Amino acid sequence: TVVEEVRRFAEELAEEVLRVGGEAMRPYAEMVRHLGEAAVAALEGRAEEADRLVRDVLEMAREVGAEGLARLLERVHREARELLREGRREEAAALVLAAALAAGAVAVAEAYVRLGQPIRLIAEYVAERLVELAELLRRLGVPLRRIIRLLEEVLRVVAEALRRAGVPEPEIRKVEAAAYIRLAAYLLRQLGYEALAKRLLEARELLLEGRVEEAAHLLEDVYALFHREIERLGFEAPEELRVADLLLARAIALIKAI
Amino acid sequence: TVVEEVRRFAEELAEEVLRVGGEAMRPYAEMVRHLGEAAVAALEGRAEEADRLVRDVLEMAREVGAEGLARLLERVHREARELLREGRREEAAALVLAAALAAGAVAVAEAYVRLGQPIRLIAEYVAERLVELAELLRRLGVPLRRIIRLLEEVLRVVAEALRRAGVPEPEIRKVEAAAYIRLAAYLLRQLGYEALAKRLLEARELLLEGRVEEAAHLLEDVYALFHREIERLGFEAPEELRVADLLLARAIALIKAI
Amino acid sequence: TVVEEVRRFAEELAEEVLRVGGEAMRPYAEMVRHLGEAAVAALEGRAEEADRLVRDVLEMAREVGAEGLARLLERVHREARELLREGRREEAAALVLAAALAAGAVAVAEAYVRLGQPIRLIAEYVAERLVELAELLRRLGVPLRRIIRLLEEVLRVVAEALRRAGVPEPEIRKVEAAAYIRLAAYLLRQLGYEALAKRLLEARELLLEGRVEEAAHLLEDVYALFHREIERLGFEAPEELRVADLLLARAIALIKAI
Amino acid sequence: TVVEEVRRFAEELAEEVLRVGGEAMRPYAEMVRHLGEAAVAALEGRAEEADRLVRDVLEMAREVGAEGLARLLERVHREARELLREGRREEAAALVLAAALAAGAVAVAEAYVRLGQPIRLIAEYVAERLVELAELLRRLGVPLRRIIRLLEEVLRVVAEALRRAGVPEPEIRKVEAAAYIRLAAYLLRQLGYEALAKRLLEARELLLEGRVEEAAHLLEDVYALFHREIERLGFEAPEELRVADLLLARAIALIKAI
Ligand SMILES: [Zn+2]
Ligand SMILES: [Zn+2]
Ligand SMILES: [Zn+2]
Ligand SMILES: [Zn+2]
Ligand SMILES: [Zn+2]
Ligand SMILES: [Zn+2]
Ligand SMILES: [Zn+2]
Ligand SMILES: [Zn+2]
Ligand SMILES: [Zn+2]
């Protein structure tokens, strides 16, 4: 069912891209669909069809004008080759799926920016998509640290896209910080820290409304309590606590830099 | 059920405006909803609430920047006063409904132009909306020549909106000519001229694809056959033939002027 | 009795405006009285009379020269429409009552500034008015965080009015900081923290006398004790504690920025 | 046998390209052969091999310098993807075969222009190849209107190629007009109008000999008789008559514009 899940994910993202953007950007739907096909090819054997499809999507990125997507696609090409030589298949499909998500998200984000919708919608959209992708990659079997690295790459591509569309920098920082707080809350919820997740999401809501100062104050309070809890456990803690610590630190840094 | 139909029409148009344009254009949803309210007030008694709502909608049109919509709103204000004094209610609500449709169609057309969708979509959207409004006005009881006059006013407002959005003039002419051919086919279908309607719609299809020359040739052939049929009946013909003749003449003139 | 309370509140504020400013500012008494009428109309059914009265009051604000009041009145217009469509009535009247209080307080504050009364009087007047309005909104049923948001909107309008009257910026900051300390003390008193409220009011008294440094020292001491008490309860606390924490943080920031 | 027919068509066109042009134009023989393989791949399953081969041929067109062929190959690529996703196979191979014929005919026409052969040979060659392709596409199952659209695309590419080779514009118009009259005669012959086709081909013979005026006069006479026959049938006529009408109109327009 895994390859069916990858196909469904790619097709749903392409349909949403077409619905939001119409026929103005049909290329992005083709990129999403071919990257879904390359991913399922990698999951079902093969190593050369994946290379060819990734090169095709790289050519489309070259002609359309997507720069960050093109760079990410070259990186997917080289890595996917290396890990397919090494015999590991899940991680190559993981890189391809992250590439497809980057393409869909850049399409939808540029659509939202062109027709002037508020930044809350872009931020919530990207955060929810990242959480869904993280759930999928957890289902496949990729290790968590690689998951977070892929998600940060996707966020970087989306931020570059929003920069090219003229969105002011503080709004881009708000988008990224919202994504980081959502990811941190998602990680914290699995281990059974519900109150922590609610406080983090309250801080996120105060951030998306433009109340930066109350967001920073509530974020620093919840981070202080969390960090005391971390130092309680000494030289032992589940890895998701360790990753959430860095996610929360980066979120705080971004909010302070707004 | 008539007032319920007017309410449903206004709310559906407002919901579509919001879906296509999002939160970027909330004012237009309010204008559509208040114009629907003024129309249903006029249909259910009253003469002062309609005045107040139309004045409020005129104020919104003034602040947003809609020029043609504001002019049409002043015009419906004055006329609605006159006919409400004369005791005729259906035609005042007809003017108000035409105003609401003009506002909604202007919003959706500006949304389509902002995100760069093809002109076939705008043309087909506007033409189908005009046909639906014509069916509604036929249900209420307005005489047909007033129906066509209101529909042409709506088309004029939409063309002005598309002009302000930078759409090139030939595309505006294509939009209007497609609207006229659709209206003419709709009128011809009721009296039982199916083949004529199919040929008119074939010519319209060739027009929307950019094949102007084949569209003009096929339009002139079908017009010649139709006009011979009209001259067959001498000094007698159902009134819809007489209206469709002028619709077809204007459609041909617009196509030639592209 | 609720609509009677709203009527009494509006008439009392209008009478006080007339007593303080005389016949110099008659428009503001009319704005207060019509905003009270729109609020009681909203509380007693209706959705169009409220629209008309708010539009009339906006016209008065436009002609008189009130800028911040006009902006807030447009915002009241749009929101009142939205929530009246959604069927919620208390919050629309809450926005209208906040607008009436902003108009009355702007009038009285400009009167006080014109005849050169000390800033302690403006600060104490505004703070007590905000406390009375908060009690009223608690009686109606508005949730507390909406209460605080409306009160901050009122404070923003009052600060803009005082800025247009030439009052120096540090006095405006003193007014706002006194208002926040009064609101925080009011919130803390309900939950049974008397000593905290007395110390906050002592710090406020030292602030209004011009002793900024002793006010900041005593405020930081009481804030440190309060915040230790907050962190004692971990991930649980009555919601008014959470709101008072942000109120105190903003009050301290404003005092430091004087 | 259909895939064998496509292979035979492609190889025969490639051999003719090589015989006419020698080793000077070897790239075009390879492009024709690869488009033959891509078409037969599409007819025998597959969707990714067709993608790859069309991209390879696009690269060849990029390096050689064929511009219009490159544009048509990009269009072929995008459409072939869409219709292969929709599951329709005959039309994608039809687009590929049209592309191969455009490439081969471009090569042969440039060869004829380089060694200075008269324009009658180019016109007759192109017209006969178009008739053969239309016969093949009729054998496959493509609808006739798509057949005519593909044939016009082939003619447009050929005209662009001849323009790039410095052939004067009136000779290009002669080529296209001869092609349209040949196509109209071919369509008319199936319905069983032998006299009409004979007179059209007499007009074509007079046109290719440089006698433009007698060509236009005889063409207008046969067109007048044909159009009277069309108007005889009213609102009913086989589709081939309708297509021939537009073909004849375009031929007359081109001859008049010489
Ligand atoms: Zn490679
Ligand atoms: Zn740490
Ligand atoms: Zn009036
Ligand atoms: Zn006529
Ligand atoms: Zn209003
Ligand atoms: Zn101390
Ligand atoms: Zn705190
Ligand atoms: Zn491709
Ligand atoms: Zn004709």
Short mmCIF file of N, CA, C and O in Angstrom, two decimals, chain A residues 83-179:
data_model
loop_
_atom_site.label_atom_id
_atom_site.label_comp_id
_atom_site.label_asym_id
_atom_site.label_seq_id
_atom_site.Cartn_x
_atom_site.Cartn_y
_atom_site.Cartn_z
N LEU A 83 22.43 6.45 -3.02
CA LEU A 83 21.73 5.50 -2.16
C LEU A 83 21.13 4.34 -2.95
O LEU A 83 20.92 3.26 -2.40
N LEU A 84 20.83 4.54 -4.24
CA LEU A 84 20.40 3.40 -5.03
C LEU A 84 21.56 2.46 -5.32
O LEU A 84 21.37 1.24 -5.40
N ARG A 85 22.77 3.00 -5.49
CA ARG A 85 23.94 2.15 -5.60
C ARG A 85 24.17 1.37 -4.31
O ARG A 85 24.50 0.18 -4.34
N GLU A 86 23.99 2.03 -3.16
CA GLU A 86 24.17 1.37 -1.87
C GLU A 86 23.05 0.39 -1.54
O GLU A 86 23.16 -0.34 -0.55
N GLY A 87 21.97 0.37 -2.32
CA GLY A 87 20.90 -0.58 -2.11
C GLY A 87 19.78 -0.12 -1.20
O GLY A 87 18.79 -0.85 -1.05
N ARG A 88 19.90 1.05 -0.57
CA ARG A 88 18.85 1.59 0.27
C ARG A 88 17.83 2.30 -0.61
O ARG A 88 18.19 3.17 -1.40
N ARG A 89 16.56 1.92 -0.47
CA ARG A 89 15.51 2.42 -1.35
C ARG A 89 14.60 3.44 -0.69
O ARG A 89 14.16 4.39 -1.35
N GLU A 90 14.29 3.27 0.60
CA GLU A 90 13.31 4.14 1.24
C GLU A 90 13.78 5.59 1.26
O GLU A 90 12.98 6.50 1.05
N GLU A 91 15.06 5.82 1.53
CA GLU A 91 15.55 7.19 1.65
C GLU A 91 15.58 7.92 0.31
O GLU A 91 15.37 9.14 0.27
N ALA A 92 15.86 7.21 -0.79
CA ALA A 92 15.81 7.85 -2.10
C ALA A 92 14.39 8.29 -2.45
O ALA A 92 14.15 9.41 -2.91
N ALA A 93 13.41 7.41 -2.20
CA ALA A 93 12.02 7.80 -2.36
C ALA A 93 11.65 8.93 -1.42
O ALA A 93 10.80 9.76 -1.75
N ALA A 94 12.26 8.98 -0.24
CA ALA A 94 12.00 10.07 0.69
C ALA A 94 12.49 11.39 0.13
O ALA A 94 11.78 12.41 0.21
N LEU A 95 13.69 11.41 -0.45
CA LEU A 95 14.17 12.63 -1.08
C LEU A 95 13.25 13.05 -2.23
O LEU A 95 12.93 14.23 -2.38
N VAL A 96 12.80 12.08 -3.03
CA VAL A 96 11.92 12.40 -4.15
C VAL A 96 10.59 12.96 -3.66
O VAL A 96 10.06 13.92 -4.22
N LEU A 97 10.02 12.36 -2.61
CA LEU A 97 8.75 12.83 -2.06
C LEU A 97 8.89 14.24 -1.50
O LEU A 97 7.99 15.07 -1.67
N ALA A 98 9.99 14.52 -0.82
CA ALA A 98 10.23 15.88 -0.35
C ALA A 98 10.32 16.84 -1.53
O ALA A 98 9.86 17.98 -1.44
N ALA A 99 10.93 16.40 -2.63
CA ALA A 99 11.00 17.25 -3.82
C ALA A 99 9.61 17.54 -4.39
O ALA A 99 9.32 18.67 -4.79
N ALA A 100 8.76 16.52 -4.45
CA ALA A 100 7.40 16.71 -4.94
C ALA A 100 6.63 17.68 -4.05
O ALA A 100 5.89 18.54 -4.54
N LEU A 101 6.79 17.54 -2.73
CA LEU A 101 6.13 18.46 -1.81
C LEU A 101 6.64 19.88 -1.99
O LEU A 101 5.87 20.83 -1.92
N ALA A 102 7.94 20.04 -2.24
CA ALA A 102 8.47 21.37 -2.49
C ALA A 102 7.85 21.97 -3.74
O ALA A 102 7.50 23.16 -3.75
N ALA A 103 7.69 21.17 -4.80
CA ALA A 103 7.09 21.67 -6.04
C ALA A 103 5.63 22.07 -5.83
O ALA A 103 5.19 23.16 -6.24
N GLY A 104 4.84 21.20 -5.19
CA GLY A 104 3.46 21.55 -4.92
C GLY A 104 3.32 22.78 -4.05
O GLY A 104 2.50 23.66 -4.33
N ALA A 105 4.13 22.87 -3.00
CA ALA A 105 4.04 23.99 -2.09
C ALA A 105 4.47 25.29 -2.75
O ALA A 105 3.86 26.33 -2.50
N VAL A 106 5.50 25.27 -3.59
CA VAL A 106 5.89 26.50 -4.28
C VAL A 106 4.79 26.94 -5.25
O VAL A 106 4.49 28.13 -5.35
N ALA A 107 4.16 25.98 -5.94
CA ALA A 107 3.06 26.35 -6.82
C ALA A 107 1.94 27.03 -6.04
O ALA A 107 1.50 28.13 -6.39
N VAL A 108 1.47 26.38 -4.97
CA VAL A 108 0.33 26.92 -4.23
C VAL A 108 0.70 28.24 -3.56
O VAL A 108 -0.13 29.16 -3.50
N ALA A 109 1.92 28.36 -3.06
CA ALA A 109 2.32 29.60 -2.40
C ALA A 109 2.38 30.76 -3.38
O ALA A 109 1.94 31.87 -3.06
N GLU A 110 2.92 30.53 -4.58
CA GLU A 110 2.93 31.60 -5.57
C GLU A 110 1.51 31.96 -6.00
O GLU A 110 1.21 33.13 -6.25
N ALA A 111 0.62 30.97 -6.09
CA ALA A 111 -0.77 31.27 -6.39
C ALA A 111 -1.38 32.16 -5.32
O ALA A 111 -2.01 33.18 -5.62
N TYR A 112 -1.18 31.81 -4.04
CA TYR A 112 -1.73 32.60 -2.95
C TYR A 112 -1.18 34.01 -2.96
O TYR A 112 -1.90 34.97 -2.69
N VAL A 113 0.12 34.15 -3.24
CA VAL A 113 0.73 35.48 -3.24
C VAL A 113 0.19 36.32 -4.39
O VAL A 113 0.00 37.54 -4.24
N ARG A 114 -0.04 35.71 -5.56
CA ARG A 114 -0.52 36.50 -6.70
C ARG A 114 -1.89 37.10 -6.45
O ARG A 114 -2.13 38.27 -6.75
N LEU A 115 -2.81 36.32 -5.88
CA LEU A 115 -4.16 36.80 -5.62
C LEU A 115 -4.31 37.41 -4.23
O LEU A 115 -5.43 37.58 -3.76
N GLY A 116 -3.20 37.70 -3.55
CA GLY A 116 -3.20 38.52 -2.35
C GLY A 116 -3.94 37.99 -1.14
O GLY A 116 -4.66 38.76 -0.48
N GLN A 117 -3.79 36.72 -0.82
CA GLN A 117 -4.38 36.18 0.39
C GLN A 117 -3.46 36.41 1.58
O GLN A 117 -2.25 36.56 1.41
N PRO A 118 -4.00 36.46 2.80
CA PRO A 118 -3.18 36.78 3.97
C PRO A 118 -2.17 35.69 4.26
O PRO A 118 -2.33 34.52 3.91
N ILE A 119 -1.10 36.10 4.95
CA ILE A 119 0.03 35.21 5.24
C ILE A 119 -0.33 34.08 6.20
O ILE A 119 0.30 33.02 6.16
N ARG A 120 -1.35 34.27 7.04
CA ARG A 120 -1.78 33.18 7.91
C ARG A 120 -2.11 31.93 7.10
O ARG A 120 -1.81 30.81 7.52
N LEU A 121 -2.75 32.11 5.94
CA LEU A 121 -3.15 30.96 5.13
C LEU A 121 -1.94 30.22 4.59
O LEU A 121 -1.89 28.98 4.64
N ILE A 122 -0.94 30.94 4.08
CA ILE A 122 0.28 30.29 3.61
C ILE A 122 0.96 29.54 4.74
O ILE A 122 1.36 28.38 4.59
N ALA A 123 1.09 30.19 5.91
CA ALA A 123 1.78 29.57 7.03
C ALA A 123 1.08 28.30 7.49
O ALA A 123 1.72 27.26 7.71
N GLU A 124 -0.24 28.36 7.65
CA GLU A 124 -0.98 27.19 8.09
C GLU A 124 -0.93 26.08 7.05
O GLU A 124 -0.79 24.90 7.40
N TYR A 125 -1.02 26.44 5.77
CA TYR A 125 -0.95 25.45 4.71
C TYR A 125 0.37 24.70 4.75
O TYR A 125 0.39 23.46 4.80
N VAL A 126 1.48 25.43 4.77
CA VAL A 126 2.79 24.79 4.74
C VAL A 126 3.02 23.96 6.00
O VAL A 126 3.55 22.85 5.93
N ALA A 127 2.63 24.48 7.16
CA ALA A 127 2.83 23.72 8.39
C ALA A 127 2.07 22.40 8.36
O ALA A 127 2.62 21.35 8.74
N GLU A 128 0.82 22.43 7.90
CA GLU A 128 0.05 21.19 7.87
C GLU A 128 0.62 20.21 6.85
O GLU A 128 0.65 19.00 7.09
N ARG A 129 1.09 20.72 5.70
CA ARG A 129 1.69 19.83 4.71
C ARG A 129 2.95 19.18 5.25
O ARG A 129 3.19 17.99 5.02
N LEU A 130 3.78 19.94 5.96
CA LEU A 130 4.99 19.37 6.55
C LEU A 130 4.65 18.29 7.56
O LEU A 130 5.31 17.26 7.62
N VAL A 131 3.61 18.52 8.37
CA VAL A 131 3.23 17.49 9.34
C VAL A 131 2.75 16.23 8.62
O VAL A 131 3.09 15.10 9.03
N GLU A 132 1.97 16.38 7.55
CA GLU A 132 1.50 15.21 6.81
C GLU A 132 2.66 14.43 6.19
O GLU A 132 2.69 13.20 6.24
N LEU A 133 3.62 15.15 5.61
CA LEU A 133 4.79 14.49 5.05
C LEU A 133 5.60 13.78 6.12
O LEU A 133 6.13 12.69 5.89
N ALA A 134 5.73 14.40 7.30
CA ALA A 134 6.45 13.75 8.39
C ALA A 134 5.76 12.46 8.80
O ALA A 134 6.42 11.46 9.08
N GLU A 135 4.43 12.47 8.84
CA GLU A 135 3.71 11.24 9.15
C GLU A 135 3.96 10.17 8.09
O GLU A 135 4.18 9.00 8.42
N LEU A 136 3.96 10.56 6.82
CA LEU A 136 4.22 9.59 5.75
C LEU A 136 5.62 9.00 5.87
O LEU A 136 5.80 7.78 5.79
N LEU A 137 6.62 9.86 6.06
CA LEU A 137 8.00 9.38 6.16
C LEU A 137 8.20 8.52 7.39
O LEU A 137 9.03 7.60 7.37
N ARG A 138 7.48 8.80 8.47
CA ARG A 138 7.50 7.90 9.61
C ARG A 138 6.90 6.55 9.25
O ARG A 138 7.36 5.51 9.72
N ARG A 139 5.85 6.55 8.42
CA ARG A 139 5.26 5.29 7.99
C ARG A 139 6.23 4.47 7.15
O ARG A 139 6.31 3.24 7.29
N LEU A 140 6.97 5.12 6.25
CA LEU A 140 7.92 4.39 5.40
C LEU A 140 9.01 3.74 6.22
O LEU A 140 9.25 2.53 6.11
N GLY A 141 9.69 4.51 7.07
CA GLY A 141 10.75 3.96 7.90
C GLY A 141 12.01 4.80 7.97
O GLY A 141 13.00 4.37 8.56
N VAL A 142 11.99 5.98 7.36
CA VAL A 142 13.16 6.86 7.41
C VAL A 142 13.42 7.27 8.85
O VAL A 142 12.46 7.49 9.61
N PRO A 143 14.67 7.37 9.29
CA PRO A 143 14.95 7.83 10.66
C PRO A 143 14.59 9.30 10.85
O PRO A 143 14.58 10.10 9.92
N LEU A 144 14.32 9.64 12.12
CA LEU A 144 13.71 10.93 12.44
C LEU A 144 14.60 12.10 12.06
O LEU A 144 14.11 13.13 11.57
N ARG A 145 15.91 12.00 12.31
CA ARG A 145 16.80 13.12 12.03
C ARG A 145 16.81 13.45 10.55
O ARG A 145 16.81 14.63 10.16
N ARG A 146 16.80 12.42 9.70
CA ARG A 146 16.67 12.65 8.27
C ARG A 146 15.33 13.29 7.92
O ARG A 146 15.26 14.14 7.03
N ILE A 147 14.26 12.88 8.61
CA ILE A 147 12.96 13.50 8.38
C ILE A 147 13.05 15.00 8.60
O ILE A 147 12.62 15.80 7.77
N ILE A 148 13.64 15.40 9.73
CA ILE A 148 13.70 16.82 10.05
C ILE A 148 14.59 17.56 9.06
O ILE A 148 14.30 18.70 8.69
N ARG A 149 15.67 16.92 8.61
CA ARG A 149 16.53 17.56 7.62
C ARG A 149 15.79 17.79 6.30
O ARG A 149 15.90 18.86 5.69
N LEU A 150 15.01 16.79 5.85
CA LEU A 150 14.22 16.96 4.64
C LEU A 150 13.19 18.07 4.79
O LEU A 150 12.99 18.88 3.88
N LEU A 151 12.52 18.11 5.94
CA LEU A 151 11.50 19.13 6.17
C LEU A 151 12.12 20.52 6.15
O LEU A 151 11.53 21.47 5.61
N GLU A 152 13.31 20.67 6.71
CA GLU A 152 13.98 21.96 6.66
C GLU A 152 14.39 22.33 5.24
O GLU A 152 14.35 23.51 4.87
N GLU A 153 14.78 21.35 4.43
CA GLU A 153 15.08 21.64 3.03
C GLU A 153 13.84 22.15 2.30
O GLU A 153 13.90 23.12 1.53
N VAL A 154 12.70 21.50 2.54
CA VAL A 154 11.44 21.93 1.92
C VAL A 154 11.11 23.35 2.35
O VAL A 154 10.72 24.19 1.52
N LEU A 155 11.26 23.64 3.64
CA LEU A 155 10.99 24.98 4.13
C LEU A 155 11.91 26.00 3.48
O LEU A 155 11.49 27.13 3.19
N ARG A 156 13.17 25.64 3.27
CA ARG A 156 14.10 26.56 2.64
C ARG A 156 13.68 26.88 1.21
O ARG A 156 13.73 28.04 0.78
N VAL A 157 13.25 25.86 0.47
CA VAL A 157 12.78 26.10 -0.90
C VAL A 157 11.56 27.00 -0.89
O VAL A 157 11.46 27.94 -1.70
N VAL A 158 10.61 26.74 0.01
CA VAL A 158 9.40 27.56 0.07
C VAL A 158 9.74 29.00 0.41
O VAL A 158 9.18 29.94 -0.16
N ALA A 159 10.66 29.21 1.35
CA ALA A 159 11.07 30.56 1.71
C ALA A 159 11.73 31.27 0.54
O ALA A 159 11.49 32.46 0.31
N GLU A 160 12.59 30.57 -0.20
CA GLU A 160 13.20 31.18 -1.38
C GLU A 160 12.14 31.57 -2.40
O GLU A 160 12.20 32.66 -3.00
N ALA A 161 11.16 30.70 -2.61
CA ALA A 161 10.07 31.01 -3.53
C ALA A 161 9.33 32.27 -3.11
O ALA A 161 9.12 33.18 -3.91
N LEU A 162 8.94 32.33 -1.84
CA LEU A 162 8.21 33.50 -1.35
C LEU A 162 9.06 34.76 -1.43
O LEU A 162 8.53 35.86 -1.59
N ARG A 163 10.38 34.62 -1.32
CA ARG A 163 11.26 35.77 -1.52
C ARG A 163 11.22 36.24 -2.96
O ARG A 163 11.20 37.44 -3.23
N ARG A 164 11.22 35.30 -3.91
CA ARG A 164 11.19 35.69 -5.32
C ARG A 164 9.87 36.35 -5.70
O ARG A 164 9.83 37.15 -6.64
N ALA A 165 8.79 36.04 -5.00
CA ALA A 165 7.49 36.62 -5.27
C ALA A 165 7.29 37.98 -4.61
O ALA A 165 6.19 38.54 -4.69
N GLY A 166 8.31 38.51 -3.94
CA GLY A 166 8.23 39.83 -3.35
C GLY A 166 7.66 39.90 -1.95
O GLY A 166 7.46 41.01 -1.44
N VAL A 167 7.39 38.76 -1.31
CA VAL A 167 6.86 38.79 0.05
C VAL A 167 7.92 39.38 0.98
O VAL A 167 9.10 39.00 0.90
N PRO A 168 7.57 40.32 1.86
CA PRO A 168 8.58 40.93 2.73
C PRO A 168 9.18 39.91 3.69
O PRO A 168 8.54 38.94 4.09
N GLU A 169 10.44 40.15 4.06
CA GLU A 169 11.20 39.18 4.84
C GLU A 169 10.56 38.82 6.18
O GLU A 169 10.50 37.62 6.51
N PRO A 170 10.07 39.77 6.99
CA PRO A 170 9.46 39.37 8.27
C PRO A 170 8.32 38.38 8.13
O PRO A 170 8.16 37.51 8.99
N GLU A 171 7.53 38.47 7.06
CA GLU A 171 6.48 37.49 6.86
C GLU A 171 7.05 36.11 6.55
O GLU A 171 6.49 35.10 6.97
N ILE A 172 8.18 36.06 5.83
CA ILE A 172 8.83 34.78 5.58
C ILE A 172 9.32 34.17 6.89
O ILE A 172 9.19 32.96 7.12
N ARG A 173 9.91 35.00 7.76
CA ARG A 173 10.34 34.50 9.06
C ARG A 173 9.16 34.01 9.88
O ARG A 173 9.26 33.01 10.59
N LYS A 174 8.03 34.72 9.80
CA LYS A 174 6.82 34.27 10.48
C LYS A 174 6.37 32.91 9.96
O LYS A 174 5.97 32.04 10.75
N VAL A 175 6.43 32.71 8.65
CA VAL A 175 6.06 31.42 8.07
C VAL A 175 6.95 30.32 8.63
O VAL A 175 6.46 29.28 9.10
N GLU A 176 8.27 30.53 8.59
CA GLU A 176 9.18 29.49 9.04
C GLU A 176 9.01 29.20 10.53
O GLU A 176 9.01 28.04 10.94
N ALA A 177 8.88 30.25 11.35
CA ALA A 177 8.72 30.05 12.78
C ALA A 177 7.43 29.31 13.10
O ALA A 177 7.40 28.45 13.99
N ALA A 178 6.35 29.62 12.38
CA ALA A 178 5.11 28.87 12.57
C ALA A 178 5.31 27.40 12.22
O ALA A 178 4.83 26.52 12.94
N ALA A 179 6.04 27.13 11.13
CA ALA A 179 6.30 25.74 10.76
C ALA A 179 7.10 25.02 11.83
O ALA A 179 6.80 23.87 12.16
#
